[PDB]
Amino acid sequence: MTSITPVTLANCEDEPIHVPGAIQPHGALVTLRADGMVLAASENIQALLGFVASPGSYLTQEQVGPEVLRMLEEGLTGNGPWSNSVETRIGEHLFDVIGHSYKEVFYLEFEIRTADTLSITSFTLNAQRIIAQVQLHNDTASLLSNVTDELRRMTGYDRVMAYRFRHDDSGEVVAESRREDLESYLGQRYPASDIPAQARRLYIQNPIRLIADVAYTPMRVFPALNPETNESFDLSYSVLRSVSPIHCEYLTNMGVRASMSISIVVGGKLWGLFSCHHMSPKLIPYPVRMSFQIFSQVCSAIVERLEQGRIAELLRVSTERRLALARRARDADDLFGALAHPDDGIAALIPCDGALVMLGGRTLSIRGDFERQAGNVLQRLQRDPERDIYHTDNWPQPSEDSPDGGDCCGVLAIRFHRQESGWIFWFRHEEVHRIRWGGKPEKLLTIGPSGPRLTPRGSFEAWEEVVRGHSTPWSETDLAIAEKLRLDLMELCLNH
Amino acid sequence: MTSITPVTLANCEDEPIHVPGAIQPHGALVTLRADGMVLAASENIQALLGFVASPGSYLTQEQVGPEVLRMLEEGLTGNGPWSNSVETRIGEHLFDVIGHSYKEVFYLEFEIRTADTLSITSFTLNAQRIIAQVQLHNDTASLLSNVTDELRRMTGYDRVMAYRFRHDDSGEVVAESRREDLESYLGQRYPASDIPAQARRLYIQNPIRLIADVAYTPMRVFPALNPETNESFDLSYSVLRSVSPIHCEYLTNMGVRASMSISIVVGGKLWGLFSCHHMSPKLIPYPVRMSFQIFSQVCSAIVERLEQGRIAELLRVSTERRLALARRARDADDLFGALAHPDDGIAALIPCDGALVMLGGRTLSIRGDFERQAGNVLQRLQRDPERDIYHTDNWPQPSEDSPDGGDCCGVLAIRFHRQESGWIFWFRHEEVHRIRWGGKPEKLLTIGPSGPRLTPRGSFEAWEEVVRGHSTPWSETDLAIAEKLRLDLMELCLNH
Ligand SMILES: C=CC1=C(C)/C(=C/C2=[NH+]C(=C\c3[nH]c(/C=C4\NC(=O)[C@@H](C)\C4=C/C)c(C)c3CCC(=O)O)/C(CCC(=O)O)=C2C)NC1=O
Ligand SMILES: C=CC1=C(C)/C(=C/C2=[NH+]C(=C\c3[nH]c(/C=C4\NC(=O)[C@@H](C)\C4=C/C)c(C)c3CCC(=O)O)/C(CCC(=O)O)=C2C)NC1=O
């Protein structure tokens, strides 16, 4: 009948974290139709605010004061995206009342900001010092290190870690600061599934996340669906949003009780995170988290400028080498020897564990003997001979049935002159042996029902599973270099 | 090694604006060794702070209070760069005290925040306004427009301008907001030497300048040379830095009394500026200038994103046309046929008033008849026969004796198959063009007791230059397209 079935092998990369319908109980949620009518609220509204915003009705100044209604009625008469907060005392004690809009729904988030003070809010001066410092760090390694230190100096979280994401969305704990009795996680690596593509999108779109108590009871917002759409409230930009039970379990295995993380975005991609953990409940006043959102935007712009400045230098140096190669082959008595010569040749341009030159049936292998792999890739490309350039980081290595076997799973190949079997190859061995230096963590636990994968060791062992057999991946600069060299060689083939 | 010192191209670039040895008098400067020993001071400290700083002493709590010494000593005991600021009262004045370190020297800068509203000067709520504004714009035209409006609304400067650099480092006022009775500078161009190379480099480093009164007298800092080095104090990052006397003369000839400007940096180049003028002295509290320093980076990142998205779209469409042309040519019996006819063909790739295809001694003309010009250019190109690409917008016209003259100013040509004199041409006729210079670009020289001063223009009257004998310039994208077509047709001739 149905003749189709959605992709459903995964368990919990698809659990939708932007529309959970549940709230962190250190605050309260109220949700409004675009006219202003109350549609749903978190049921702790009475416990914190002393009033019920009755669904199907409107707020009153005798509930929220005028201060909130200035904001909301400039909101309700506003257009496009909206976001604001206001300072007030509700009943006996102080609140931050925070609000935004998304997909025609207007949201009110009430966060407690009581038993803390302007003196404590001197954290605003610390955040502005962090913002002033980062703008002058000269590389991303020192930037991430110093920020990971000073974030902890400021906030007093038990741990802070800098994550950096690789081309495959795997992550590495590239820097750490910790309370010294706690185990270090420096140099851990984890698979891309550790941050599912929805959390990817939310950390790109929503610079700050705060988790006040991993042991929280989630406040059910009621009614559960917006009566106008008859669909879930999209909480993507809220702050009180329910954490996924999977990540609460993962943090409970780590023994974490509260979290804050600060996004770094580059090129519209999640380039990194700072992640802060504390082993007992912790809460940060909203005015400070606004300053960390500002910090996230500043840091993202700085990192993106540094990484673009690095890539431009890579492409510069490679171009200046390749033009010398072209010059030498044009001036010399032979192209083929000038390609294979160790002092300047194809083996110098691209990082490789070996290189092979092929032209007119002549072949040479540099740093090894690769005429087997060259033949085998040609026999693969003989199934698609219109392909000009081929590369892989995961070639099926020659088997142990013969000394023809060997580690060259990385191949990069140029057809520079199809009419005389002019080819160039570069090769790479398997990566993992070079990088195998993250120590496996060992924390003794009463492990949660999901089992040991929701732990740093589980994640590390599941990461090695992912990189087994892969070479060091061919960089976009490497591919650009091969692309350009092909066309430099064609000019010599043409004039020869 | 080199045994010679590089010579600068023009004395415009020689003035070392980073080492004036003086500050603007609306504040004071103290400079300290890495252990906090005083090295040099501005001459006005007692006139402003009430005490004399002596080199070789240390700043004492009786002089600056505990908040400053806490800030400074938390600086000195830090690692790497430092910058911080604190709000404090000294004598009767409220001060902003701004600290930074650069090239192993520590600086303390004092700004009086006298007679201003402590509430509305809150840094974070100022940053909120502009950063909420910038992120709502979909293109650089509306971005620079409404940002220039919000900048004027916030600061109350008499004029704000968006200034955009050209490929020759000239620049043009692309947006403005002004007091109603003032002249409008919108659309005028200004020659490249109005912002010298070293100024543009410094403004890539330091995003914000302010001049509180263009009429100021610099407060010298004594001693002028740092005893640790006997070199000048590099003031590149100081906020009180004495702006160049030449630029103060420039703004005096504009009739401006106070200035602020904000860098826009894209791709590691100074891409443009926001610049602000007031016809009376004006000073902006440091928290607001800090919020503009943040805005400078967020705006630069967003301008970079928008311009990358535009150029990438142009590249996409052009590459699709180039490959469609290659598909036609490779699938045609004569390349020289499929190149010519208006069903795509060469004339479709680049905006041109004429084109010609030449190969093997054949010629064809498109949108006209160009064998005369082509022959003349190729005979001229025998003077540089290794050259494979030639272009001009200013082909030197013949005398008026006949319209047989090869008057076509715009020529672009590529040698795609030298072995058969394979040449392609694109042409553009003259475009009569008009430039409103902001002041006539007279020679920037006056002779006096200093010798020849590089004096700015005598007035800023809009003076029109009428440009004739030029085509529309060949764009860098046009040249990139010609290059890629050259390589594609080199491949195709290599097979043919
Ligand atoms: C070496 C130690 C180590 C640690 C501590 C580690 C944890 C980790 N979880 C993160 C986030 C999330 N993960 C999941 C879901 C799942 N997490 C998985 O691993 C798989 C099984 C799974 C689903 C397929 C979700 C929904 C979120 C978003 C939660 C939210 O923000 O509401 C992040 C980034 C943010 C942060 O720092 O908390 C980190 C760093 N990963 C490691 O390797
Ligand atoms: C309406 C149009 C308009 C334009 C085009 C404009 C340009 C401009 N020049 C700037 C900087 C400098 N220019 C020069 C020197 C030269 N300038 C010239 O004209 C010739 C005579 C000359 C040398 C032979 C120097 C040394 C500096 C560094 C100053 C310092 O930082 O000490 C700045 C940034 C400063 C600011 O915010 O005001 C701007 C915004 N200002 C306008 O209002």
Numbering used by the authors:
A (entry chain B), B (entry chain A): 1 to 496
From the paper:
Phytochromes are light-sensitive proteins that are found in plants, fungi, and bacteria. They exist in two functional states, Pr and Pfr, distinguished by Z/E isomers of their bilin chromophore. The chromophore can photoswitch between these states but also thermally converts in darkness. Most phytochromes dark-revert to the Pr state, although “bathy” bacterial phytochromes revert to Pfr.
In order to solve the structure of the PrPfr heterodimer state during dark reversion of PaBphP, we made use of its expected relative concentration as derived from spectroscopic observation, and cryo-trapped the protein on electron microscopy grids at 120 s, 300 and 960 s after photoexcitation with a laser diode at 780 nm. The newly observed structural state is a PrPfr heterodimer with one protomer in Pr and the other one in Pfr, as judged based on the secondary structure of the PHY-tongue, isomerization state, and location of the chromophore, and the rotamerization states of key residues lining the binding pocket. (b) The cryo-EM structure of the PrPfr hybrid, reconstructed from the 300 s dark reversion data (the output module, not clearly resolved in the reconstruction, is not included in the final model but is shown here with decreased opacity). The observed PrPfr heterodimer structure is naturally asymmetric at the tongue and chromophore regions due to the different photochromic states. However, we also observe strong asymmetry beyond these regions at the dimer interface of the PAS/GAF domains. We conclude that the interface region at the PAS-GAF domains is intrinsically asymmetric in PrPr and PrPfr (but not in PfrPfr) and that the positioning of helix A plays a decisive role in breaking the symmetry. (b) The orientation of helix A differs between the two protomers and correlates strongly with the photochromic state of the protomer in PrPfr: the relaxed helix A, the α-helical PHY tongue, and ZZE state chromophore are all exclusive to protomer B (green). Instead, we recover high-resolution information at the chromophore and tongue in both protomers, which allows clear assignment to each one of the photochromic states. This finding is supported by the cryo-EM structures of the hybrid state, where the H277 in protomer A of PrPfr is refined into a position with distance of 2.6 Å and 120° with respect to the D-ring carbonyl, which is a conformation that resembles that of protomer B in PrPr and is unfavorable for direct hydrogen bonding.
